[PDB]
Every structure is written in structure tokens, then in C-alpha cells.
């Protein structure tokens, strides 16, 4: 099964009207390190909810 | 006649002395509290709104809390309306118990059926399967033809096809009331009713009778 007519650039754009990404609503700030992090995830320096939880 | 809101507790059996096992659904019917009364003057129809159960105060939004506050009833887990027959009367704040069903022989029970998700035509519509063997190519449970030819050159509305099954409102009519235990807040009805254990049920006196 295949198109009988070439779809327009208009229709292409309409289909892609739902393809947009969502930015991360809000990042959190660790209360000790001050680093930004995804909520409920550890920071890059291994902090979570103030506590140093992992090395590196 | 008004109904009550209850909760499907589960199924069991009642043995009778004459040696019959009656399959029963156990419906827990706590006090239904009237939250609002609707009348012709203001609303254009007669009905009561009832709540039942409980709700943690922090889960009750301010709009909901204000509604319960006006009635002067504790917040329940939801609101349900029942249309009033011409004879009936109720007041805001009033409790209605399962004693309501004391003399009722048959009830209708409305619930949300269990959710089967996306179901095929075999399960959803009892379509017959095609041959398992004798050369069938990739078409064992598929629906077969879905229309005619150039006339009408379309598929008719309401064609039975795969789709969401269950997780919808279902009423089972004319179930026998086996027992009404006011003290335990229990209604026993004979037979199965819609929904999973724990689900809300609406119980009304049977319309057919």
C-alpha cells in the first residue's frame, strides 16, 4: 500500500505538530553542594538531599 | 426509589440448611450522607447527592471542602446523585443506611467492569477463528472481511473491530438480595457484579421487578 498523491509540506508539518520536545520542567538545587540536578537523582558530584552518597 | 453507594468486598457463598450453596457478592454499604438536595425550582429536577467513606483532609481540595462544609458532612471518597421519585423526601446532612434495602427483593448493581485493555475481535466480539492449519497464511485470529466491494466502498459505522474492552460502566439487573446486615453494613447479593474487589458499586432497587 502506497500513496496515490504526494502529501504536501503542509500535511507533513501538521503531522509533526506533536513531535516537539519538552524542556525539563524544573531542575532542583542540592542544599549542601548547591549543584543543579534532576529531581530525585543524585548530583554529578555524588550528592543527594544534602548528603554525600557516593564517591566520584 | 433511591440507591446506595457501596464497595465490592469480594465473593463468597451462603450455605442454606436445605443444602444449597448460594454464590454471593459481598457489598459493604457504609452510611451514605446527603451532601445536596436538588429541586425543580433551582435545578430543574429532583435528586439527592450523596457521599460515602472517608478522605484524608490534605487530599480534599478547597472547592470540594467548601461543598462538604455547606452540607455539614465529613468529606467522602466521592459524590453520586440519585433521582428522587415523587413521593420521596430527604434533607441535607441526613445519613442513609443499608436498612433502606431491608424489604427489597431484587437490586440492580452498577460498576466499572475490569479492564482488558486493547482486545482482539475474538475476545471482544466472539468472532470465530480461521483455520489453524490447512494452509492458512498469517490469518488465524484476524477479523476476515470488513465490508463488501465498490458498493458501498466504505466500512459501515459500528463495525465490530479490535479495541479497548472493559473498564466501562456496566449494570447487572435483578439480582436477589440474600441478606441485609445493618449492623455490619453489609449487603449480600446473589451472583457476580461488575468490577474488581475494592471497586465502587451503585446499588438500586431493581427497575424491572
Amino acid at each position: 500500500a502506497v500513496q496515490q498523491n504526494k502529501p504536501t509540506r503542509s500535511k507533513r508539518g501538521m503531522r509533526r505538530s506533536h513531535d516537539a520536545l519538552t524542556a525539563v520542567t524544573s531542575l532542583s538545587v542540592d542544599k549542601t553542594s548547591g549543584e543543579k540536578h534532576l529531581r530525585h537523582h543524585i548530583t554529578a558530584d555524588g550528592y543527594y538531599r544534602g548528603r554525600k552518597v557516593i564517591a566520584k | 426509589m433511591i440507591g446506595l453507594v457501596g464497595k465490592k468486598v469480594g465473593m463468597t457463598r451462603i450455605f442454606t440448611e436445605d443444602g444449597v450453596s448460594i454464590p454471593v457478592t459481598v457489598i459493604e454499604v457504609e452510611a451514605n450522607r446527603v451532601t445536596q438536595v436538588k429541586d425543580l425550582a433551582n435545578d430543574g429536577y429532583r435528586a439527592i447527592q450523596v457521599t460515602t467513606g472517608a478522605k484524608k483532609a490534605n487530599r480534599v481540595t478547597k472547592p470540594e471542602a467548601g461543598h462538604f462544609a455547606k452540607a455539614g458532612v465529613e468529606a467522602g471518597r466521592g459524590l453520586w446523585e440519585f433521582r428522587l421519585a415523587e413521593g420521596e423526601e430527604f434533607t441535607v446532612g441526613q445519613s442513609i443506611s443499608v436498612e433502606l434495602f431491608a424489604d427489597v427483593k431484587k437490586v440492580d448493581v452498577t460498576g466499572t467492569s475490569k479492564g482488558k485493555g486493547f482486545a482482539g475481535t475474538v475476545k471482544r466480539w466472539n468472532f470465530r477463528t480461521q483455520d489453524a492449519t490447512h494452509g492458512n497464511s498469517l490469518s488465524h485470529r484476524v477479523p476476515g472481511s470488513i465490508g463488501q466491494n465498490q458498493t458501498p466502498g466504505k466500512v459501515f459505522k459500528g463495525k465490530k473491530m479490535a479495541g479497548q474492552m472493559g473498564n466501562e460502566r456496566v449494570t447487572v439487573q435483578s439480582l436477589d438480595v440474600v441478606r441485609v446486615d445493618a449492623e455490619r453494613n453489609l449487603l449480600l447479593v446473589k451472583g457476580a457484579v461488575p468490577g474488581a474487589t475494592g471497586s465502587d458499586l451503585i446499588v438500586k432497587p431493581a427497575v424491572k421487578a
Binding site: - | 457463598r13 450455605f15 443444602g19 444449597v20 450453596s21
Partner: protein, 123 residues
């Protein structure tokens, strides 16, 4: 749970040994016959000098099934085999004079009281 093509033993002394159900009577598209139901049968195996002959087409009542019968308290009675009693095609009365093996109380009716009375055991 007897259907067309099901082979049954015979629980009587009609002379038949094996019979085959060729029709479940009593409704359009009726699928199954259980204990107490009338079926149309053909005789597949018969004793030399019996009241019935191989190839005869008559009726029978199912008296024992492997699927069994449920009772009002939820109990079940299952038998090791399927068995029927041959009936006259018109009168629907037993052909044999003796019943072999147990039968159930599902037969307790004006129609099959002769079978009940002749049966060595009723469950």
C-alpha cells in the same frame, strides 16, 4: 458432555455394547447432552442375539458422563466413562430390562422412573 460422534457404553441389557451419538435432541444448534438428556444414536457394536442390531438408529438417555453432574451445594459426581440407556424411538421407554452400574438422581422423573427402579445404585 456428549456430542455428535461421541461413543458411549450401554448401561442396559438391550444387546448393544457400543453406540455413537448422531444428534443431541431438543434445540437448534444444541451442542451437548449431559446426564438425563435424550440423544439419537446409532449402534456400532451389538451382541449376536440381542433385541437390537448393529446399524440400528434409535434414542438413548445419557445416564453417566465423565464430565459428570453438579449438585446444588456445588459438589460434583464424575464417572469413569460415558454410558446411556437405549430407548424406543417412538415411546421413549427403555428397551432393556436390566440396568448395569450406578445412575444419578438426575433421572428421578416420571419419564425415567423405570431406569431408577432397575438401577443397582442411585447417587
Amino acid at each position: 458432555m456428549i456430542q455428535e460422534q461421541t461413543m458411549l457404553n450401554v448401561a442396559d441389557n438391550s444387546g448393544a455394547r457400543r453406540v455413537m451419538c448422531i444428534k443431541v435432541l431438543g434445540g437448534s444448534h444444541r451442542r451437548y447432552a449431559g446426564v438425563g438428556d435424550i440423544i439419537k444414536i446409532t449402534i456400532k457394536e451389538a451382541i449376536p442375539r440381542g433385541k437390537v442390531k448393529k446399524g440400528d438408529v434409535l434414542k438413548a438417555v445419557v445416564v453417566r458422563t465423565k464430565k459428570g453432574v453438579r449438585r446444588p451445594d456445588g459438589s460434583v459426581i464424575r464417572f469413569d466413562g460415558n454410558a446411556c440407556v437405549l430407548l424406543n424411538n417412538n415411546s421413549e421407554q427403555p428397551i432393556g430390562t436390566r440396568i448395569f452400574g450406578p445412575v444419578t438422581r438426575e433421572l428421578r422423573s416420571e419419564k425415567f422412573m423405570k431406569i431408577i427402579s432397575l438401577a443397582p445404585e442411585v447417587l
